[PDB]
Amino acid sequence: MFDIQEIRSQFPILQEKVNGKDLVYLDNAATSQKPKMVLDAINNYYEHYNANVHRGIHTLSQVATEMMEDARKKVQRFINAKHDYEVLFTKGTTEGINLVAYAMTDLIKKDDEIIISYSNIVPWQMLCQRTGAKLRVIPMNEDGTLQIDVLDEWLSEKTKLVSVNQVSNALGIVNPIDEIIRKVRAKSNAFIFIDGAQAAPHFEIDVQTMDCDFFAFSGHKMYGPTGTGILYGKASVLEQLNLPFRFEAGTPNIAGNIAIGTAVDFMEKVGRSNIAAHEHALLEYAQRKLLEIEGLKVYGEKANRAGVVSFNLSGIGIASDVGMILDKLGIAVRTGTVRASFAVYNTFEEIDILTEGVKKAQKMLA
Structure with a gap:
């Protein structure tokens, strides 16, 4: 009985807007929301x-x-x-x-x-x-x-x-x-x-x-x-x-x-097994969608990992350049690599927003 919408309703900060955009908080390895x-x-x-x-x-x-x-x-x-x-x-x-x-x-x-x-x-x-x-x-x-x-x-x-x-x-x-x-x-x-x-x-x-x-x-x-x-x-x-x-x-x-x-x-x-299962599915989905972007590399791709996708774009050096574009889209990640990290309230819809944001960043920076 795992209802992602019931979970997200418990976190008031999720309704916050950033630079006019829905907050997509993927910096959970830095700190979690409450x-x-x-x-x-x-x-x-x-x-x-x-x-x-x-x-x-x-x-x-x-x-x-x-x-x-x-x-x-x-x-x-x-x-x-x-x-x-x-x-x-x-x-x-x-x-x-x-x-x-x-x-x-x-x-x-x-x-x-x-x-x-x-x-x-x-x-x-x-x-x-x-x-x-x-x-x-x-x-x-x-x-x-x-x-x-x-x-x-x-x-x-x-x-x-x-x-x-x-x-x-x-x-x-x-x-x-x-x-x-x-x-x-x-x-x-x-x-x-x-x-x-x-x-x-x-x-x-x-x-x-x-x-x-x-x-x-x-x-x-x-x-x-x-x-x-x-x-x-x-x-x-x-x-x-x-x-x-x-x-x-x-x-x-x-x-x-x-x-x-x-x-x-x-x-x-x-439910601790429910958290692990949901987060493992977020991670697999994000790594899959990110690797479809041409030139993107995922560090520790084959490794067993908990809640973190780290990546770099091929021709972009200052990862912060990508981080700043992502922030203007409402997406919070850690930034010479980009670190997206998941908590229980994150969604597959948010990962799609991340992936489209990363594609947009790379052509913006070309």
Whole structure:
């Protein structure tokens, strides 16, 4: 029971016009748009329940505290964490990364090794600057995939942390996380950090079967407010760093944490398999229609990808030239390649608008 029109009716910004045109929002990998239930949660919190949490004894403080803890349990079930106290509220993926990178400082000695995948690589580069650790980077192949067989030679007793993004943000490539984790468990005692910021909006997460040690993601990419994120960690691993209060300092973003639970509710209401199916059909259709344009190349064309078509036109260098023409047609994409990225509310009719817009751009720029 998947009604694209019922879904789109929940997103008020979809009625917005841009340069006199219907908004065609295909920059979802940058940030997603928000359904009414999430915005209602924010507003209802501030108009009825706002108070500080945990420390207080009066009624509003009790209700506010309970609502935030209810939201933690929604996220727990959403990623199938075994315990609510393994779910930490943060302000974004970048915060979760920095939290782990700083807390690892004491567990890394003078010649240990950190392995990362191919712009938040600074915390790990800084962690190696503090310790005596050597940073190692998994190379990317030409087609955008990771050269993960390098782990067969790099993993050793020296490897203390491996950090991989589950989905690449530029190309949308789904990295082979289960094979990587299996390799890391078999040949090292390293902690495994998975950046799921581009994964959590698009397909179901089960951190228990995934066997990651950490899993981090951002609310704003998955229909939630800015300023929110989640860091999951195995209790047995969190307890080695320096629950969940130990890792949540200062006043929490109470409203945002409540509302990211409402964004979980929205996804569960739509259906996570329905989202994946609809988005996979959008992606296949868009890549098919775009490849009919003469001279257009699709990066990672043969790769398994989540919600992202990246492309370049043959004779057009500044991709922004195409992006500006598309924006004047109402189409929002990321721009030396053009990145169109899908969310649950996008339509096949919108992809046709994109494809006709790209054809028009290339002859405009000829």
